[PDB]
Amino acid sequence: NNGSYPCPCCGNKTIDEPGCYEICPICGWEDDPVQSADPDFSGGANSPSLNEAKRAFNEQ
Ligand SMILES: [Fe+2]
Ligand code: NA
Ligand code: NA
Ligand code: NA
Incomplete structure (x- = not known):
């Protein structure tokens, strides 16, 4: 669905409240506040770090 905040990974506005573990469709x-705080931290709610996930999404 449309939201009001950008997904940290793909940048599309799918988030209702940042840092509340919403999963981007x-x-x-998964909007884990640890992983937006430290974009190089792997193994939070998401296996990839945010930086890893951003690159992976873009290369699709
Ligand atoms: Fe996303
Ligand atoms: Na984007
Ligand atoms: Na930070
Ligand atoms: Na890492």
């Missing part, structure tokens, strides 16, 4: 990123 476009790219699959």
Whole structure:
């Protein structure tokens, strides 16, 4: 669905409240506040870090 905040990974506005573990229906990123705080931290709610996930999404 449309939301009001950008997904940290894909940038599409699918998020209602940042840092509340919403899962993006476009790219699959789970909005874990740890992983937006540290974009190089792997193994949070998502296996990839945010930076890893961003690159993976873009290369599709
Ligand atoms: Fe996304
Ligand atoms: Na984007
Ligand atoms: Na930060
Ligand atoms: Na890492």
